[model samples]
Target chain A: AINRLQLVATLVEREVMRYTPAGVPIVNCLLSYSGQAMEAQTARQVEFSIEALGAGKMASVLDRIAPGTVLDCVGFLARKHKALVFHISGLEHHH
Target chain B: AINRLQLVATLVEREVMRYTPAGVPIVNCLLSYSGQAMEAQTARQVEFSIEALGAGKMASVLDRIAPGTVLDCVGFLARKHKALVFHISGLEHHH
Candidate 1:
């Protein structure tokens, strides 16, 4: 049966801004999904912006996504006046 | 047996810059892995920089990571020379 897919969830944040010991900004989250056919699909995609956090927070945030479940992700950080771009893909599956 | 977990993959970008209707910059990608222990690990951590692309392009790129596969990711968006960081975690598992 062909099915239509859509994301039905809310983005909840504990705080808008937190910082690491090194003074980098960080953001934490807890997301839940609610919709028909959400459970039938093999996967769901998540994307957000990081306009204030630093490299350290970025690394930690991405690491929390759990292996295998995370297919790919990219980051943008600010260094001086310009932002630096980085990309990563292929997460090992956790059995 | 105890083995060291390492990333045996390379990051590939389809284009350095792609724009959207709002003049946002975007990037595309394809990644592959190669190694022994790389397969054993359940997950991996990815980190990167995004100092140029606009919010619209960033959103599209994150959506491409494949749902349920991506665990978490953070990004920094540049607005008027200032960056705002965003974080996302939680990927639905595919059957």
Candidate 2:
């Protein structure tokens, strides 16, 4: 099965860099998205946390970014501690 | 933000038809999907529950579907009760 989510949202929550035992850099952030439903055009809003990380350079990328930035994120979801978490596959920044 | 998830998974849990106060028919189910990550090709599996509904005929369609059925679902996520809930926008059944 394939699980994928592509979202354009504003960053609402952000954190500093962290590392795994293997030294993989990780960053955590929350994003807020708002739009209308496709079929009915009803209003909808969602705010979700996403885990993001990459190579060494990515840590800097994540660090410099501030909240309220609008960007696109591609990711998957997994359940953790009674909640769903997003594992980011790719992130595109926009000024 | 634009929030959308398209998943191909096996139905692991399913419920009988239910209705809302507005008489909208609703069905609930869980799905399991597995695949390697994109760009990195890492193994990952996600099992998620989805809330699905339809205008009328879909209630019967949902009523007859059994567990382990493979299906494609497109939906959006919303924060609910300190967690994220998937609201199915569309569902397609496969034998």
Candidate 3:
């Protein structure tokens, strides 16, 4: 099944990097999106924050990125605890 | 900016179809997703239900589709009030 999310957002919150017992680097953060979207032929300003997690190389990049940095993120959503968390597989700085 | 979400989910709840003042058809729904996802080189079960909306031709189809029908949905997330709503631009039955 396809379950992908491609988003351009601002990194609003980034936590300290951590390592798993297997030595995989991991990080958790919050991404904020705000832009115009079209619905029913009408454009509206959309805004929200979503929980996201990255591991390995992605985690290393997220851990070093500053808040307010714009990013192009690709990921899949999965439940962690009781909420949906974006399991980011790829990301890059947005120009 | 890219803010697209492509998901394969079950239509769990579908509101009655309605019309806007401009005569555009609209339908609101809840979509549930449950499947396996790979993260950090490990696989886990993922589940969630997200609010979604369809308009125009898409609304006509969603209005007639039954709950439990699996759909391949393409949309962008937007805020309505304080919650994230998926504004669907395209959808089709999952094979």
Candidate 4:
């Protein structure tokens, strides 16, 4: 099955870098998105926050970026326990 | 800002077709996805259920599809009220 998401949003919440048992780096954050969408042929303003994370080499980059920075994130959605979280595969700074 | 999602998942929950004040058709459902992903250079099994909806022309087709059917959905993610929701722009039967 395919599960992928592309998002341009602001980093609303960020946690300090952490390491797994195997010493792999990890960074977890919350992304806040606000934009316009078409629903039933009507314009709607959309806003929400979602949990996201970066791991491996990307974790180092994410850890250094301050919260409130806009990011271009390419990721897949996954369930971590009971809630949905975005697993970022690629990330870049967005202007 | 860009916000798009591509999902291949099973229809787990479906609601009866509804209409907007302007008479545009709408269908709301839940999608269950299971797959493997590479995170921090490690393989992880991922599973999740997300809320999704079909509107306009796509609503008619979604309303006819039975729960448990697999589908390929291309859409954008948006916030409807307090939660994240996937809004379908394109959908197809997945083999």
Candidate 5:
């Protein structure tokens, strides 16, 4: 007889390699999962490249170290880059 | 710097070989996957004939194999017969 396989992420940990004088650092981590019989896995690697200035400083507060953390940071970065591109292009479309 | 690569799947065992008058025989298996910077895999093979002594003597039992075992029983019953097509007396159309 054949059976189905199941996999789940158990934990996550990250380390910061560099930081600013104000105590902000660039960090990243890897995620992995394991199971028996069946398994489905994918990876998402990224970096935190925001500068510490005004609103940027506040955004840094969102960074943290934790286990079993699932973050949808892709949308956030996409929106941020879109805004920067629009500003550089000097196209006043909408706020 | 770039980061983000995740994969999960571990521990799985299976085997189905042949049986006797009171048992069964004839089995097949093949599945593999690997990951590093990021890798995906896929494979599927199957075959099971039965026979008992009623309803065409049931069906012959299929053999079995184990985990990490790569088997290509394609040669199990080698005779190289050309493809055969059946003909019908009339053409059919569906509503």
Candidate 6:
């Protein structure tokens, strides 16, 4: 099964970075995309949350990004509890 | 951003197709996908729901599909409360 997801969305909620016992950094953010799934004249909104984890320099970038920014993220979806969370392995900010 | 998702998954839970007050048929099913996401040897399970709707004869087909079947579904993601649901515009069974 293919689990890949490429999401370009607005960072509606950017939470502070947290740390694991071994000191790896982790961050969670809610992203939103509003557009047509088909040929609809006007679009609808779709929002989802993504979590990114890393250490050192990778951790630094994750902590600096702010809410209301735009981003392009590539990840795989995983089920946690009742919701499907995006697990990011690649990310970059957008204008 | 593309709202499109092409999911090839196994149907773990299937429910009877229901109908709207106006007679449109709607069906919801939980689909499970298990595989490698990023070069790991072990696999993980990701389950999701897809809601499909139609009229007349299209309703008949949705009512008959069984669990343990494989499916290829194309849909868009939408947020509903705490979860993101897949809204199917296309579907098919896989052997």
Candidate with best lDDT: 4
Model 3 segments more than 4 A misplaced: A18-24, A38-40, B19-23
Where's the lowest-lDDT run of ten residues in candidate 2 chain B? B50-59
In candidate 4, position B31 carries an lDDT of 92
Model 6, global lDDT: 0.60
Ranking by TM-score: 4, 3, 2, 6, 1, 5
Give the per-residue lDDT digits (tens) of candidate 5, residues B21-85: 64433232222222221100112221222111101111121122224443221110111122111
Name the better of 1 and 5 by DockQ.
Answer: 1
> lDDT per residue, candidate 2, A6-91, as tens digits?
87877786777888687777677776676654632244444555444433444556667778888787777665434455666677
Report per-candidate DockQ.
0.04, 0.56, 0.60, 0.65, 0.02, 0.39
Whole-model lDDT per candidate:
0.29, 0.64, 0.85, 0.86, 0.22, 0.60
TM for every model, in the order presented, reads 0.21, 0.78, 0.87, 0.91, 0.19, 0.71
- Sorted into a CAPRI-style docking class, model 5 comes out as incorrect
RMSD, model 1, all Cα superposed? 19.1
DockQ of 5: 0.02
Off by over 4 Å in 6: A20-23, A39-60, B21-23, B39-61
Chain A TM-score vs. truth, each candidate:
0.28, 0.73, 0.90, 0.92, 0.28, 0.69
Candidate 1 per-residue lDDT, tens place, A1-95, comes to 00111222233323354665856554443323222211212222333332222134353554355322322222211132334322221222222
Number of the candidate with higher DockQ, 1 or 4:
4
Better of 2 and 6 by lDDT: 2
> Per-residue lDDT of B15-71 in model 4, one digit per residue for the tens?
999998888988999999988775425777788899989999888889899899999
Where does candidate 6 chain A have its weakest 10-residue lDDT segment? A39-48
In the range B15-77, model 3's lDDT, one tens digit per residue, is: 999898889998999999887776446776778888899988989889999899999999898
- Tens digit per residue, CA lDDT, model 5, A22-49: 5544333333333221111112221122
> Ranking by lDDT, best first?
4, 3, 2, 6, 1, 5
- Give Cα distance to truth, residue A21, candidate 2, Å: 1.1
